[PDB]
Structure formats: C-alpha cells, structure tokens
C-alpha cells in the first residue's frame, strides 16, 4: 500500500557488489530487512525482486546449505506473498536445471518439492520438479520409484497448466507404468486422456505415442479389435500416410488383426469398411486376406498358408513383415489366433447351410481329428458363439432350432403376405406395360 | 363425465428430475435408523404371511423426532431418491390456507392421490405445524388448525391394511404433539435420530472427509475423541470450513492446523462457570 | 402494486388513482394546524433551540449544510418529568413550521390483528415521503418502544414487533432523508437501545422541572 | 406402557429373524431395549430439569 | 399524434381480458384442466397453434373469457411484493466507508462472493460452499451497512426484507409470502435473501402460548423447511442480522442454514480511527485535528456515535456561525455525545 520501488531499486545493486566482494551475511540480512518491510507494506514487486536477487545471489556462494536454508525461510516468511513465492520457485527450476551434482541435484529438488508442496501459486512447477526427479531416478535404474513419484501427480486437476504439457505428462505416466510391468493402472491412466485432443492443431507426435502405449497394452492379454482400431487412427494421421511405408505398415497391421479378431457384428462391419479401402490394391497378398476373410465359402487352411504362409511370417524384403507373426512367443500365440479364426469361420459357414452334418464329416472338412473337433464345437456353444446339439450317440449335428408351432404359423403367414404383395406388384408392371404399348 | 381418478393440485415428485442427489452411502452410521425407516416402509411391503402369524398389526406411518440436526431430513430425501414407489412431499405449514375448508380439501386431495397409487410415500415434514396438543378454540384460526388435525386424524384411520400407502413426518419436539396422533393404527413407530455418539462421529467424519483432499498428516481419531457434545451437521462444517481456510491461503491440501482451526471455530465453548464452583 | 381504474366488463385499465393508505394513516395527518408561537413557552430556551436546529432548519436553509458537507440530524427526543413541556413545544414547532405534519400516539400503532401495526407504521412513513418533507411526531413513544425481554407470555412479542418496523424505517436499508421524527416519553429508561442509538433518535433533549424563573415566566 | 411396547417390539424383532414365533432370547433384547430407551427418556427429562 | 393516440385509444377500447389460471393436466390432446385463480376448476380446450409441449403441470395460461379456451402461457408470477423486496436501492455504499471492518468483510466474500465466480476451487478441496452467515453484533456497529456495501458492489441479484413485514393477518399468508420469495430467488440464480431483523420471527418455538405465538411459528418452520430441506437450494444465498442472536430457534442457528456467525462489535482503538477519519473526510476543516484526542474520548462509542461526532461538529461549527470545523467544536463534539450516552443501556447477546 506504500510504495518502497526506489528504495529497492537504490539498494539492490549495492547488495549484489557486496555479496560478490564477500559480504554474504550483511546483504542477506538487509535484503532481509527490505522483505520484512516491503511485505508489510505489501508490495509484491519489490518483495519479488528482492526474492530472486537473495536466491540469484545464494547460488553463485557455492552455498548449498545456505541457498537451501534461505529458500526454506523465505517461504514461510509471514504474510508472504504468493506471486513472490512463485517467482523465487520458477528461478530455483532454472537453477535446478543448472546444476549437475547428483546429490546437490537430488537435495535441491527436494527442497523445491517440500516448498512447493500443495499451492496453487506455484503448481505447474511441482509437476515440472516431479518430471525431472522421475527422470532422475529412471535412468539411475530405478523404475518402481519413479513409477510411483510420476503417479503421484494428478496432472487432470491443473486447470492453469497448459493442455499440452498436461498431455505428455500423462504419456511419461503410462510409458512408465507399462514399463514396471503393471497394466490395470494403465487402463486407469488411459481413459484420463481424452482422445479428441488429438485432433486440434499439431498433436502429432503425442498422437502416435498414445497410440503406440495401447497397442502395446492390448497387445498384454489380446485385445485384438481394438489393436486394429489403434493401427487404424495411426493410418489416418497424415504424417504416416503421407510416406509410403509408414501407412503400408499401418494397413498391414490393421487388415490383419481385423483378421485376427472374433467374428461380431462390429468386427464385421469393421472389416466391410476397411474392404472398401482404394489404398489397399498396394497389398495384393493382404487385400486377398481380407476378400478371404468376407467371402462367404469354406477355406482351407492348407491353402492359406501355403500361399501367405511367407508373405506373412517369414516376411518379404519387397513387402516389410510386421510383427504380428514374428518368431516371439506372442508370435506363436498370434499365429494359433489366426487358425482358430480361420476354424470358427469355417464353423459359422457350414452353420449357416447345413441343417445336418456327421461328425465325422466336419471333422474331415475342418481338418481335425474328431475329438479336437467336438471339442472346438463344444466350447463355441457354450460361449453363445453359435447354436447346434451334437447328438454323439448317433454322430449327427443339428444346425436347426426348435420349430414351434406358433412360429411355424407365423412363418405361413408371411409367406401370404409376401405372396400378395408380389400379386400386386405384378399387377402394376402388367397396368405400366399395357399402357406403354397399347394405346399404339 | 367422469375423469381419470385425481385432477389434484398436490403435483408428486417426478422422480425424474426433482429426485434428490442423496445416495444411502452419503450418510454414515445411523444404520440403526436406516433399518427401522427401511424396515417399516419395506418390510411390510414384502412378506406379509409373516406379520400376521405373530398378531402383530403392521405399522401405518413412522415419526422421525430427534434433535436439531442429526439427519432428519437426510434420510427421507435418500428414501426418496433410492425408492420405487410414487414419493409425494409436503410441509404441514403448508396445509393451513386461508379461507374455510381449504386447508381439510387439501389433506383428503392429499391422501386420496396417495390412495389412487398404490404404492406411495407421503412425507410431511415439520408436523409440528398441525398436530400441536394445546388449543385455544376460541379464536376461530386455532379452530382452523384443529380442524386440518382432525382431517389427518379421519384419513389416516380410514385404511383396510391392504393398501400400500405410507405416511412418514418429521418433528424436531414430539412432546408437543398431540397424543391422538400417536394413538395405534396411527402412527406407530418412532425413530430417534440422537446427536452421534464416538463411533457416529468417526464414522460420519470419515464419510464426509471421503471426498476430501486431506493429507495422510491429520489423525481424526482425536477430533472425534473430544468429549464435546456435537449434532451431525456441525460435523460437515467443521469438515467443510476446513477446506475453507485452505482455500483462503490459496492451497488444494489440507493440514492439522487447518482443521484444528475449523474444530476450534464450530465448537465454541460454553462460558466457563467461575471456578469458585467445584 | 399501483392502483388502477377498469372497465365493469371489458376489463381493460382505464386510468390512474391516488394511491391507498388505510384510513387509520391518513386521520393522523394535521388538518388544524394549531397555534402557539415560540413566546408561550418560557423557561426552556436552549431545549428549543436544540429542537428547532435538529428539525426545522435544514428544511429551509440546507445550503448551509450541503456546505459544512455535513449530513444534518436523524431524530429528536424530547423527555422530561410529566407536564414539562414536552407536547407544547412540538404543537408549536407544527403551529411555526410549514411541512407536512402528522400526529401520533403510542398505543395508536399497536392493532389487534397480527401485522397491522406495522402496516400502519410503513403506509404512515410511506404517505410523510410522498407529500414532500414532513415531520412525524410519536406522542407517548413509550407505548411501543419498551425493552424486549424472554418471558413465556405472550402478547408483548406484536408491540416489539412493529417496534423493530419503526426501528428498520428511522435508519436502515434504503436510507430516508426527507422525512424527520419527534418523540417524546416521560420514561427514558425503559425504552429500547436500538431506538436510542445514535443514528435513529440522534438529538435527545432534556426537560427540567422548571426553575423559579421559569416558573415566573410560565405564570 | 412400557410392558405393551415390549410385546410389540419383541414380536417384530422375531418377525425379522424370519419365523412364526417369538423367541425368549428375542424377548430379552426387546425388554432390554424398551428399558434402555426408558431410562434414556428419564434421564433426558432429569437433564433438562438440571 | 393526437389522432394517433385517439385511434389507438378506440382501438383498444375494444378488447377483452383473459382470465388467468394454472394447468393442472392435459386430459387428451385437446382437453386440459385449468384452474382459475379464482378457485373454480374448468376442462377446456386449447388453440390449434400453440406449443402444446410447454403446457406441463403447473403452467401459468390465460384463458378467453367466453369460451375458457387456453391462449397463452406465461412466466411464473412475481407477486409486487416481491417486486418491491427486489428492487430497493442501498444507496452506494462501497467498501471504502466500511471502517474498522476487515475480518468479517472477507468472511462475509468468502461465504456469498467467491463461490459466485471461483467454483473451481472449491471443487479442487472438494466441498461445498456455504449457504448463509448471521450477522450479530451490538447496535451500531455496520451490519446493515455491509449489507447494503454487499448489494451495491455485488453482481448477482439482491432481496432485501424485514422479518417484521413479512407477518400478516390472514391465516397462511406470510408462509406463502416466504414460499414465493423463494420460490422467486431459485429461479433467478444467482441471488442473495438478506432477512433484517429475523429475531422478528425467528423466536424459539414454545410448547405453551397463543395464536398468533403459534402462527409466526408455522412462519418460521416454512422458512426453516425452505433454508435446508428436501429440495436442495443450490444457488441462492442468505445473510440475516440482529441484536439478539440469543432469541432465536436453535434449528435456525443450525450449522447447515446459518454456517458463518460473524460477530461485528464495537471498534476498536485503530478501528475507531478509521472510521473517524472515514467520515470525517468530507467536512471542510481549519487547524490540526488530532484524532487521537477523540479515539481517546470516545470509548464504548460506535460507528453511528462517531457519525453523530462529525454531524455534531458541524453542528457547533455553524451554531457558531463560521465556515469551518475547528478542533475545538470536535472536542465539544465528543463530550457531548458522551454525555448522551448515558441512557442506552451496554451490554451484548450471544448465540447461546
Ligand atoms: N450421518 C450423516 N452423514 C452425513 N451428513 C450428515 C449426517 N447427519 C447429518 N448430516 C448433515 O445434515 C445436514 C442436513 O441436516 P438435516 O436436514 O438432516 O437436518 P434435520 O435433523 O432434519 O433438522 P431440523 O430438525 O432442523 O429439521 C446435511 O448437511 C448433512 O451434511
Ligand atoms: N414551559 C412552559 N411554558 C408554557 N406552558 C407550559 C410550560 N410547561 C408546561 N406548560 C403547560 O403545561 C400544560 C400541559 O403540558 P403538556 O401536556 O404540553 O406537556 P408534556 O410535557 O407534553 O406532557 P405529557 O407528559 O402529559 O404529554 C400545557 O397547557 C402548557 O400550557
Ligand atoms: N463502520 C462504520 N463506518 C461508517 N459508518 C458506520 C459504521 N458503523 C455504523 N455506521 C453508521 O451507522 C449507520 C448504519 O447502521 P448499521 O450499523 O448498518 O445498522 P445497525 O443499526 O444494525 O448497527 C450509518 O449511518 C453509518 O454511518
Ligand atoms: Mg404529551
């Protein structure tokens, strides 16, 4: 409420000459006194000032302790004001990325944590400090820790720090957590972000980190749709479409985990749209995959291997593999992922038509054993996939459901309905037809 | 013509957007009074081959007296929110109208709405408006008064124990009412809802503080050993302006000095009998 | 709120009335006028002066305190043993003074029904702001302006109640200054210390029994 | 009073262990709480009498 | 222009009213029941091009008089009552002349103000801020006065009543007249309910006594029952005032519809200079003024007795006949209004 600008101004520089010449002890004291004065007063300006030119001053004494220590007692100086405080905070981040000593570095980022623990004044920097000690402690291989210090920050709530910054934080958040091999926290972490951000002006770089952090997390227990949904938005953003291998990898990896995935019907309008895809004639072998996969007719899975056997496992230096179907174990999983849908679409095939087939016979068609068959079959219908009664004494499997009589009825009658619609149709072709022709 | 069964005025809860925002898991404690509320306006709504084996005739309505602000009211509007039935909601200062015979039309339009659905709550908050046992009829309003009494009275017997309409008010001086209301097949059970005793204290701390920032540093366990005589709304303002000074130092944490400061505000401490005494 | 006149059947307002104010307002305005000149009261000099100052003179010369930037008074008190002169001097100051004056009497603002006491005092306030500068004078303030105490019998609570109306119209929300207050009361001690207060009932005046030359004088 | 609101109490305690009958054990806990919440009203007035 | 208004006055000459009542229901698409304020229900019909979608259960409509058929829907009515609680005028007080004042005023922001445009952090601590704060203290001190600052500086919406003119002689008209009013202020959120003097009608509620005891008891359990009750308030807030906090029900003092209990006392030795120098500003002075002196003679006093030091003073000043206020006339100032001091009686009540 009193002003004390000229007073401050007047005494800084002396101050600074002091200190350097090795006065440290007098000039504190006064700048001291001026902070007491001026906060009284009130006077955010010069108490800021003041601040920085004590903390500026500290650092260049080789002083630790006392930097520290006089950190410490600025903050909680009385009635100290925030904005002060906060620009003290913002010149201990610069120094903090000054310095180099691991234990200074280490000592000094926990006093700037224990000051800025908990004020809204000074909270974007929090979780700078907190990001760099996380880094700290991970290359000093350390991973838990800094798992659990990055956790600790909950970056949603900072409704002053910018969206973007708010972004890679959660990103290093779930980069970490994959990497201490926890997931369910992953899951937690994920819907946090919003996936509309990254639409708005530049979010590329981001975009494909988040992508890649799921694929990575679906990829833990299968979750294949959703793989394909990742590689799929990862296609559409421009920057891999606008090299050739980068969206070549990107369909690649889309047809065949849409391949890969379970029959549904999103699934199945999922891969009517992606059949549709003019870009695909570049993958002759894959788009033959995919018409393999809509086509409706029974497929061996001799010939599928046979022919894409080595354009996808084995890869091709014209055509890049990916590694859906490397050697990894995932591979192995991955590669009988892909016979047990070719099995099940076999399976849903012949139950569409088929009202009856011998055991004996499916098993041959499927090109299993019997045992290994009625076993697939048992476990589709147990899991709702599809309906039909294995009558083992007899070796016969009923594709068709019970017709009651009701039902039975009902379909008589739209069988007439239909018949009278198609009476009147008829009837209007035969008025048109007359009428074109016979008025000549 | 002969209309739908009610025109009315008496509008029930939508239940659709006038529906409190009170889950039954807001509150703490008070499971006691959760059972015997639920447990009279539910379990003679299931079973019934079991209330008459024992002769015991089921309840008709339930009076909830207790202290000023120990969740009267609370817990009718979480019944109101968690519930099925048609919830219809009053006031008994609301009932005494101006002119003659307005005030008897609008209890029996009342209970009749109830009537036509058969599954129904009525809630009558503040009862101590009407049911008060001292009468001066000499004057005409207490006349008046008396008059909304009687027609409570005259509705509430007319029940065939078969029809699943429920009555449930609130007073905070049940020795004010008159006896007539607590009479069987009225009103038959009461509810004290007592100011929270240590284990109430905790456990309404802990569900009030649930929502909290609240740093691991503060140990509730010795805000509720105080031995300080305290209702349950006090409890949320203690809770609440603690949080109000964080805010005012610019803070998202809350520290034990900060609550110590709202224990110290909301619990004022009354005037030290001079020591001369004891 | 305003008072309208309609058709019988069309029901289509039709012109402006005069506001309402209860009969009971309007029968305590002065009509009469009444006659008694500054020279019939001897004895208390410095009283009518103080009197005089407080209620009459910013009437007329507000300049003078527009300049000083002064706000005048709020109020005049006048309380003295009984027969003292109190009544006197106020039908005087009515007899000299030119706004409008109205009467008043404790016990007339006290009513049967709940909530017409207050009425009559705000409709009173109301009728003294509309017709330019007046002066209200409460003749026996002492009906209504008892202290308030906890007791169980009731009855009492109504008096305190359009008490705390005079109380809330003197100096509250929406400060009135065109209209100025007269009181008078045998017993100051038992009125209430929110209508004493220095910003209702500003200037209290005393009224000794009066000395030998003002007995002379009054002779 | 008292002996009329136990009978009813204990009638209903019974009735939510889910039987046809009251029990002795039931009984005793009405009678307990219908004592209980009588000293607690005695005590409640003598406390507002202090 | 004269013609212009005489055709427009013959043009209006012909023309109807429509009664005004509520809808209740809407039996089929063309039948609804209304009922006339009057009282008398009526089945009616409705005009074919009017949005029959907000006609719910409780919508004001104006009915043709001969054939009752709906013709318009309208706002819910605000009685002029309301009106007039709605539309005073604080002159404009600021903060400024407020003295000796700087606690409460920031408890008094915090409580109404700072949830009014900073609701995010109170959702960051996560709580709910508070609904209303009483205001007691000994007369004279600025209650009313930092009400008035509160509806002058403030942006929301402002309802100033008297709990004495709520109460009226017709049985249920001063609960419906409460009901209304806030009925009123849920509508135009935000907005502040400033009851003066609830010791008026907030009075501890007694088992024996008399009608009207009775009646301005039914008062305050509607205003109870409206503060905290089954309905939510949200965002409307509430401030009261009085000298007898004592005298008041304790469900009204109750920690969820009274949250804050600001005490504003007699000033303090700086506070007493503050406002001093606060009112004394725009006097026109000759000399030094020591307002020690006065701080020192004026103890027990309060803001309106230090306003009536400055007003006295002027007084002096112009019963002298000079231009000016000089020390000495604020020194006979001071002694005089202690003199007058001797009748009020001192002491204070306490929320007990
Ligand atoms: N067990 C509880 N858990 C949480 N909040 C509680 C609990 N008991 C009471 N409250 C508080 O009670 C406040 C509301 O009080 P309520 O309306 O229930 O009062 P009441 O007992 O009906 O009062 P009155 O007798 O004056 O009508 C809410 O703010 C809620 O915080
Ligand atoms: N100083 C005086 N000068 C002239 N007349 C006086 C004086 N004192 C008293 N009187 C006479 O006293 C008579 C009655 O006194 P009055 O009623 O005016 O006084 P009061 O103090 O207002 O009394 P009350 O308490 O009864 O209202 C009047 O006729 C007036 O003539
Ligand atoms: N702190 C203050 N600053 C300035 N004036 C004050 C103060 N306190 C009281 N007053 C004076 O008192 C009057 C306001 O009365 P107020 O305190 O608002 O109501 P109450 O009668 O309830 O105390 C005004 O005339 C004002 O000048
Ligand atoms: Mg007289």
Not at chain 1, 25 to 46: G, P
Not at chain 1, 80 to 107: G, N, S
Not at chain 2, 202 to 211: Q, V, W
Request: proline residues 4%.
């Amino acid at each position: 409420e009193v002003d004390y600008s000229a007073t401050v101004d007047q005494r800084l520089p002396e101050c600074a000459k002091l200190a350097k010449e090795g006065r440290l002890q007098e000039v504190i004291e006064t700048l001291l006194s001026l902070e007491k004065q001026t906060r009284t007063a009130s006077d955010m300006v010069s108490t800021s000032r003041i601040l920085v030119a004590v903390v500026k001053m500290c650092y260049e004494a080789k002083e630790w302790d006392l930097l520290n220590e006089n950190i410490m007692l600025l903050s909680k100086r009385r009635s100290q004001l925030k904005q002060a405080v906060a620009k003290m905070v913002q010149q201990c981040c610069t120094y903090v990325e000054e310095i180099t000593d691991l234990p200074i570095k280490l000592r000094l980022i926990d006093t700037l944590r224990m000051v800025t623990e908990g004020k809204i004044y000074v909270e974007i920097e929090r979780a700078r400090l907190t990001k760099t000690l996380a880094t700290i402690k991970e290359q000093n291989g350390d991973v838990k820790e800094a798992a659990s210090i990055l956790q600790e920050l909950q970056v949603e709530t900072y409704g002053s720090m910018e969206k973007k910054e708010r972004v890679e934080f959660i990103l290093e958040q779930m980069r970490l957590c994959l990497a201490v091999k926890d997931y369910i926290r992953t899951q937690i972490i994920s819907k946090k972000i919003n996936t509309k951000f990254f639409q708005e002006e530049n979010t590329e770089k981001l975009k494909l980190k988040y992508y890649n952090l799921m694929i990575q997390l679906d990829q833990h227990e299968g979750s294949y749709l959703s793989i394909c949904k990742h590689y799929r938005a990862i296609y559409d953003t421009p920057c891999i479409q606008a090299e050739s291998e980068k969206w070549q990898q990107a369909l690649k990896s889309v047809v065949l985990y849409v391949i890969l995935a379970p029959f549904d019907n999103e699934q199945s309008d999922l891969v009517h749209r992606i059949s549709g895809d003019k870009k695909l004639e570049e993958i002759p072998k894959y788009k033959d995959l995919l018409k393999l996969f809509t086509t409706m007719e029974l497929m061996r899975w001799s010939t599928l291997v046979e022919d894409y056997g080595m354009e996808l496992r084995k890869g091709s230096l014209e055509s890049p593999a990916t590694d859906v179907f490397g050697s990894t174990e995932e591979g192995e999983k991955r590669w009988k992922d892909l016979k047990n849908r070719v099995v099940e679409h076999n399976i849903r095939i012949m139950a569409k038509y088929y009202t009856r087939i011998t055991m004996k016979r499916m098993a041959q068609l499927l090109d299993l054993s019997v045992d290994e068959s009625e076993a697939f079959l048992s476990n589709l219908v147990v899991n709702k996939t599809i309906f039909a009664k294995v009558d083992r004494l007899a070796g016969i499997i009923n594709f068709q459901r019970p017709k009651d009589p009701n039902n039975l009825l009902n379909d008589w009658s739209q069988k007439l309905n239909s018949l009278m619609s198609l009476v009147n149709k008829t009837t209007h072709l035969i008025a048109k037809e007359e009428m074109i022709h016979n008025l000549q | 013509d002969v209309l739908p069964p009610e025109a009315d005025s008496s509008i029930m809860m939508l239940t659709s957007d006038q529906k409190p925002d009170v889950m039954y898991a807001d509150i703490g404690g008070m499971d006691i009074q959760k059972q015997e509320v639920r447990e009279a306006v539910e379990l003679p709504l299931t079973h019934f081959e079991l209330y008459k084996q024992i002769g015991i005739d089921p309840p008709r309505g339930v009076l909830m007296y207790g202290p000023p602000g120990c969740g009267k009211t609370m817990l009718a509007k979480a019944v109101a929110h968690h519930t099925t039935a048609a919830f219809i909601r009053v006031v008994g200062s609301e009932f005494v109208q101006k002119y003659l015979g307005e005030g008897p039309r609008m209890v029996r339009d009342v209970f009749r709405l109830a009537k036509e659905n058969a599954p129904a709550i009525i809630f009558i908050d503040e009862i101590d408006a009407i049911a008060t046992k001292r009468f001066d009829a000499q004057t005409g309003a207490d006349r008046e008064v008396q008059r909304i009494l009687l027609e409570l009275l005259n509705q509430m017997d007319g029940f065939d124990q078969n029809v699943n309409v429920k009555v449930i008010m609130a007073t905070n001086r049940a020795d004010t009412l008159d006896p007539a209301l607590l009479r069987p097949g009225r009103l038959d059970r009461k509810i004290e809802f007592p100011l929270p005793d240590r284990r109430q204290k905790r456990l309404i701390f802990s569900t009030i503080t649930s929502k909290m920032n609240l740093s691991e540093e503060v140990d509730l366990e010795d805000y509720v050993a105080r031995p300080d005589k305290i209702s349950g709304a006090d409890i949320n303002s203690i809770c609440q302006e603690s949080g109000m000074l964080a805010v005012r130092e610019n803070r998202y944490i809350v520290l034990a000095k900060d609550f110590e400061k709202a224990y110290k505000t909301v619990i004022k401490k009354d005037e030290q009998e001079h020591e001369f005494y004891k | 709120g305003d008072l309208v006149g309609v058709n019988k059947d069309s029901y289509l307002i039709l012109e402006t009335l005069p506001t309402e104010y209860d009969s009971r307002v309007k029968a305590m305005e002065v009509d009469e006028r009444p006659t008694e000149q500054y020279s019939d009261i001897g004895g208390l000099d410095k009283q009518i002066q103080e009197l005089v100052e407080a209620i009459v003179l910013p009437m007329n010369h507000k300049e003078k305190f527009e300049n000083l930037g002064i706000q005048p008074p709020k109020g005049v008190l006048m309380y003295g043993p009984p027969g003292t002169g109190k009544t006197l001097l106020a039908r005087a100051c009515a007899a000299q003074t030119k706004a409008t004056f109205l009467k008043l009497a404790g016990p007339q603002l006290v009513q049967m029904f709940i909530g017409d006491g207050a009425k009559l005092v705000r409709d009173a306030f109301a009728l003294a702001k509309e017709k330019a500068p007046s002066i209200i004078f409460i003749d026996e303030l002492d009906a209504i302006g008892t202290k308030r105490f906890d007791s169980e019998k009731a009855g009492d609570r109504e008096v305190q109640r359009t008490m705390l109306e005079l109380l809330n119209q003197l100096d509250g929300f929406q400060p009135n200054t065109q209209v100025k207050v007269i009181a008078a009361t045998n017993r100051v001690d038992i009125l209430d210390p929110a209508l004493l207060r220095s910003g209702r009932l500003d200037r209290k005046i005393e009224f000794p029994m009066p000395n030998e030359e003002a007995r002379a004088r009054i002779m | 009073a008292e002996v009329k609101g136990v009978c009813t109490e204990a009638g209903m305690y019974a009735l939510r262990e889910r039987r046809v009958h009251v029990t002795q054990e039931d009984f005793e806990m009405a009678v307990a709480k219908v004592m209980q919440k009588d000293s607690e009203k005695n005590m409640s007035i003598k406390k507002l009498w202090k | 222009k004269q013609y212009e208004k005489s055709e427009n006055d013959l043009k209006a000459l012909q023309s109807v009213g429509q009664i005004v009542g509520e809808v209740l229901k809407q039996l089929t698409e063309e039948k609804f029941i209304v009922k006339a304020t009057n009282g008398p229900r009526y089945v009616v019909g409705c005009r074919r091009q009017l949005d029959k979608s907000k006609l719910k259960p409780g919508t004001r409509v104006a009915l043709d008089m001969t054939t009752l058929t709906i013709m318009r829907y309208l706002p819910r009515e605000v009685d002029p009552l309301v009106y007039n609680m709605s539309h005073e005028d604080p002159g404009n007080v600021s903060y400024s002349e407020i003295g000796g004042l700087s606690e409460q005023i920031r408890e008094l922001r915090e409580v109404i103000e700072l949830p009014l445009t900073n609701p995010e952090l109170f959702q960051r601590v996560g709580i709910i801020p508070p609904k209303g704060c009483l205001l007691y203290g000994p007369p004279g001190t600025g209650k009313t006065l930092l009400a008035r600052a509160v509806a002058s500086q403030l942006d929301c919406n402002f309802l100033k009543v008297v709990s004495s003119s709520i109460v009226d002689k017709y049985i249920g008209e001063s609960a419906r007249l409460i009901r209304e009013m806030f009925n009123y202020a849920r509508d135009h959120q935000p907005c502040i309910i400033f009851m003066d003097e609830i010791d008026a009608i907030g009075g501890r509620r007694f088992s024996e006594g008399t009608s009207a005891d009775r009646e301005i008891q039914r008062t305050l359990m509607e205003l109870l029952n409206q503060m905290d009750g089954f309905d939510t308030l949200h965002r409307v807030k509430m401030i009261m005032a009085t000298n007898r906090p004592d005298t008041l029900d304790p469900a009204l003092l109750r920690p969820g519809r009274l949250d804050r209990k600001i005490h504003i006392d007699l000033p303090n030795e700086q506070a007493r200079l503050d406002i001093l120098k606060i009112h004394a500003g725009p006097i026109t002075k000759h000399g030094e003024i020591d307002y020690e002196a006065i701080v020192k003679l004026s103890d027990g006093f309060n803001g309106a007795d230090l306003r009536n030091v400055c007003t006295e003073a002027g007084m002096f000043a112009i019963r002298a006949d000079h231009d000016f206020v000089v020390q000495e006339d604020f020194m006979k100032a001071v002694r005089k209004v202690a003199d007058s001091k001797k009748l009020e009686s001192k002491l204070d009540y306490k929320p007990v």
